[model samples]
Every structure is written in C-alpha cells, then in structure tokens.
Target: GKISTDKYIFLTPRAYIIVHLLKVGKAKASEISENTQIPYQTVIQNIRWLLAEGYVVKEQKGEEIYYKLTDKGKQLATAELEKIRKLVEVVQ
Candidate 1:
C-alpha cells in the first residue's frame, strides 16, 4: 500500500511543479515556462518526461500542444500535496 506512494517520492521537484501547473487545466508550454520562470528548454524537457511517463497527456490544440494531467497525477498532487500542506500547518 505505502510502496505505491513511494514511487512518486523520487520524482524531481520541478516535475512535480509541472504536475501542479497542469492541475490548473490544460496549459501551453509557453504558459508554464513563463509562469514558472522554468525556461522553455527545461520546461519542454520536463513535459517530455511527464509525458514519457503516464502522468500527463499532450493535446493537439491548433498550433500548440497543451498539457493535461492524468488521474494518477491528479490524485498525486491533490492528496500527496495536501498531505504536505497539512504537515506544514501542523508544525510549529
């Protein structure tokens, strides 16, 4: 049971941020890059890795590709991130 959650613990923090960004909704790479100040090159690279896994999907929206999170990613961000947020609040 706990082992499944550990699978996500090893992921990069920026990649986790990308997951949160897409949690906002399907977003263009440029939007994530500019909003996060993550640099487009790294942004693209990050997206590719997320896509390489199953956390995100690429949508062909006109000329641009938009990124959308999957069910696995949605729960990971909402549940696990919420856990961290609660942990912070509980601390002194």
Candidate 2:
C-alpha cells in the first residue's frame, strides 16, 4: 500500500484531493493546492488528469473555475478508500 510500491498506481497525493472533494463538494485549484500542500503546478496537473478522464467537471463560477467530481469519480473515490481501509486492516 506504500506509495513507493508498484501497487501505488493511483497517485497518492492526487487521490488524496479526490477523497477530500467528496466532503468539500467542490473547490478551486488553489484551494486544493493549499489543503493538500501540493504545489500549484502539481495540483493543476492532477486536476487536468481528472478533468480529461471525466472524473471531474469544471464549472465557471464568475471568473473562477471550480472543480467537482462526477458520479464516476465518487464511485472511484469510494473504491479507493475501501481499498485503503482493507489494507490498513490487514496491516493491523
């Protein structure tokens, strides 16, 4: 389950934001960067991947672009969380 392992296909930091989005519902790229402590470039790059893959949608609210997960993203995020939970259980 360690990020350094080959099993860590889903970028850990990027996936972390996706899990957080489930709670925040939506957020700006800067907010995601701030919350995750990831650099703006890294945050935006991961967000771009989510957008391109249809995992998230960008909404133009005034001058800002906010991102929210799609239904597919929620499902994926849930699955990822479950996987983490199971791994932790096994570790314990």
Candidate 3:
C-alpha cells in the first residue's frame, strides 16, 4: 500500500537546498549536486522551482548558470534555522 498524505505532508527536497545555499553563498547546479549529494536532475528540477518562487536568483554568464539566495530566501532560511533550533531543543 502506498503511504497516504492525509495526515502529514513531508517537506520537499528544496527545503534542504536552502540551508546549503545559505552556507555556500552561491553555487552552480553541478557544485550543488556534488556538495549536497542530491542528483543533478533533482537539483535542476528544484532550482527551476526556486527561481520561479523568488527564493533564488539565477544569473547566466555565457554558457554557465549560477544561483544565489535572494533576500526573501534569506528570510525564509533564517526561519528554517530557528525551526531547527526549536526541534533540536525538544529532542535534547
């Protein structure tokens, strides 16, 4: 039987990417893929969504594409970190 989403909706893969981008500052899709251990295809998919959602800004310099966290994304990343702190406090 397939797991039901009736009760809980899990965080998408993009959630992890926020933390990585915050720590790394800026990176290419390949670098993100290598550093985060997320597949290149998945990174591209999530990157597309991030760009569309204003969470990330992409720059195209000739043949290369680079991504960085936007101001909106920084705010969300801060919130994400706070949430993690709270969860950790609960666990300890």
Candidate 4:
C-alpha cells in the first residue's frame, strides 16, 4: 500500500541497479556500490529509499548493516525483469 511516483518512476535507474545487485545476492550496500561502480554514498541513499518503501530489510550485525530484499521487493524486481526481457526482445 505504500507506493509513490511524481512524474518520476519510484525506482530510478540507480535504484534499479541496487535492486539488481540485491537479487544477485549482493545484499550489502557496500557490495552493491562496489559491484555496480556506483558510489557507496549514493548506494546508501538509494537503499534508504528502498528501505522506506518496504522493498528491502536490514539486519544490524554488530556495527554493520546487512541488507536483503523483502517479499515485496522480490515481486517488484521480478516484474521489472519481465519488462527488461521484453525490452531486450524489442530492441534486438
């Protein structure tokens, strides 16, 4: 029930990269930032938005935070993947 878009997609391309990274089992913000060549701080910002939207969950392991996708996140990511598949087919 918590969703919003104001002439802009809720998941920006950066956020999409974050989601993709998480789906690939890179569950930490640092890991996502490192793998995608995105800045760690930028990854943290996008992750904060995902967290607020119920798209991600976090666990505090000592002083570090481990992130993972929620069920809702997985569902959304799956949908996005379907779109990607179609886009590739069309573009190719």
Candidate 5:
C-alpha cells in the first residue's frame, strides 16, 4: 500500500515528528528520540513512515541519519501543534 499504516502506534508519534522537523529545521532520528523521550529505534521507526509518506526526506551518511521537511510536507507541521491530549487524561 502506498500509504501509512500506523495501527498499533498512534498518529501523534509520526505527526509529532513533523512538528519537530519544522521546529528544528533539520534534526536526526536520535535527536528526535531526545525530544520525545522515546527510544531511538522507535524514532527511526517513526521516521521510516515519514519518508514513506513523503512528509520528510533523509540524508544517509553511514551510521547516522538527518530528517528534514519536504516542500509539501511543511504544511503538515501545523496540525500537531496542540498537545497530545489522548495520553494526558490519565495524569490530569
């Protein structure tokens, strides 16, 4: 399928990445993990979908990766601006 299939994981993770991309202008999957407080592998996993969905582009340099926003993708950055209210209800 030529689309995203984030069944187990919610959309926020991937969408949040777009915000980070625009927020930082350019960042790494490793750096994304730091911002989200999630695991590095998961950040890579989320980035995998972004590239697939054309929301981001990557520059591969051996062991590391840098994620940047695409021309059309820049628009997606606005949607996830609000908090991820779904997960916050439990604590608040």
Candidate 6:
C-alpha cells in the first residue's frame, strides 16, 4: 500500500529536514540547505515551524545563528521515523 503521509504528523518536508539535521547536530540554514539540497528559503520556513512547535532552539554565535534540536523534538522525530519503518514493514 502507498502510505498516505498526510494523516500522519502533518509536518512539512522542511520539518523533516530540520529533524534529520538536528539528529546529526546543530547547523546553519545554509548548511542544511546544502546538505539536503532543499533550498535555504524552504529550510528557513521549516525552521520557523520548528521554532513555533518548540522543537528547536536558536543561539547566536557571534553574528550568525545556529540551530539545535531539543530533547522533545528528538523523541518526536524518532517516533515518527519509527512509524515510517512500521509502515514499510506492513507493506512487506
């Protein structure tokens, strides 16, 4: 079955990118965009959503901002990824 992902967490692609990046560690928007090939604006938009959800935090290092993943966000991202894994299992 093609899992319809809309009914899941409803997080945007940007959100998934943030989660994945955070799982790797704190990074800047450009870094995320470069790594994910998702574009800076999109990454920034997702970052806003993460900020609104209290899933991520920003800190100023000199004149630049860095993003880090909160514990709760990690838990949520892990759970969501697990759900995806489960979906794949069911299909198999």
Best by lDDT: 2
Model 1 / residue 37 / CA error / Å: 1.3
Report the lDDT tens digits of candidate 5 across residue range 18-80: 777788988988788799766677678878877898888997699777889887677666544
Q: Candidate 6, which segments miss by more than 4 Å at Cα?
A: 1-12
Q: Model 5 Cα displacement at 31 (Å)?
A: 0.6
Residue 15 alpha-carbon offset, candidate 4, angstroms = 5.5
Model 5 pairs in collision: none
Which is the winner by TM-score between candidate 1 and candidate 3?
3
Better of 1 and 5 by lDDT: 5
For model 1 the local lDDT of residue 46 reads 69
Report the error of model 4 at residue 82, Å. 0.8
**Order of candidates by lDDT, top first?**
2, 3, 6, 5, 4, 1
Poorly placed runs, candidate 4 (over 4 Å): 1-16, 19-26
TM-scores, one per candidate: 0.69, 0.84, 0.81, 0.73, 0.64, 0.78
Candidate 1 per-residue lDDT over residues 1-92, each given as its tens digit: 33224334644535455565655688888888777655678677767877887777899958887888877767656787687678879985
Largest TM-score belongs to which candidate? 2
Ranking by TM-score, best first? Answer: 2, 3, 6, 4, 1, 5
Regarding lDDT, does 5 or 6 come out ahead? Answer: 6
- What 10-residue stretch in candidate 4 is worst by lDDT? 1-10
Q: Note the clash tally of each candidate.
A: 0, 0, 0, 0, 0, 0
Model 5, TM vs. native: 0.64
Per-residue alpha-carbon lDDT of candidate 6 for residues 1-92, written as tens digits (9 for 90 to 100): 32235433454555557566656787887788787766678688878878889888887779898887787778777887788789889999
Cand. 3 Cα-lDDT: 0.80
**True-vs-predicted CA distance for residue 36, candidate 3, Å:** 0.8
lDDT of 2: 0.83
